[PDB]
Design a protein around this ligand. Structure first.
Ligand code: HEM
Length: 154
């Protein structure tokens, strides 16, 4: 997959909006993931005691982890597909330490798109959604290729 220069422009335009409130976006994306797919919460030893949305929103540590996640994803997207070097440490930890299937990356991709609609209702149209879906699919396909490079079936 290759994005047009126009599609990358759209992705980076949207990402400038996430960067204005990284902690808010990151907290919402993780809660959305955990509510929609509660099996993913069991992968987080630090958070799996949290049982309800209201407990999750009160967790300062969940919020900090949201910042960690979006900061790495942002550095990757700014490379406009030339991201091999940035992917390698991410693929390494998620395949070999956390043991996260690619399917769970599809679930967090759906949570990102849901939260971008919920936080930017007039600012995230069909064209920007299409470009972001393509950039996140590019990311998932390339990280699935790095899993295989490391010897894992994602
Ligand atoms: C956009 C996709 C994602 C990005 C950019 C990302 C990024 C990160 C980063 C930067 C860290 C800390 C350093 C590291 O361990 O590598 C981390 C930790 C972790 N990730 Fe992800 N991650 C993503 C998706 C996922 C998903 C979907 C799951 C599970 C359902 C997951 C499970 C974990 C766990 C369990 C940790 C360790 C948490 C802890 O510190 O207690 N990751 N991730």
């Amino acid at each position: 997959m290759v994005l047009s220069e126009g599609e990358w422009q759209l992705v980076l335009h949207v990402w400038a909006k996430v960067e204005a409130d990284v902690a808010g976006h990151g907290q919402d994306i993780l809660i959305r993931l955990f509510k929609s797919h509660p099996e993913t919460l069991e992968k987080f030893d630090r958070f799996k005691h949290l049982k309800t949305e209201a407990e999750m929103k009160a967790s300062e540590d969940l919020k900090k982890h949201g910042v960690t996640v979006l900061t790495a994803l942002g550095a990757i997207l700014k490379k406009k597909g030339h991201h091999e070097a940035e992917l390698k440490p991410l693929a390494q930890s998620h395949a070999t330490k956390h043991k996260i299937p690619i399917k769970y990356l599809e679930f967090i991709s759906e949570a990102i798109i849901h939260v971008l609609h919920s936080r930017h209702p007039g600012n995230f149209g069909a064209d920007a959604q299409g470009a972001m879906n393509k950039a996140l699919e590019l990311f998932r396909k390339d990280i699935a290729a790095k899993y295989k490079e490391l010897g894992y079936q994602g």
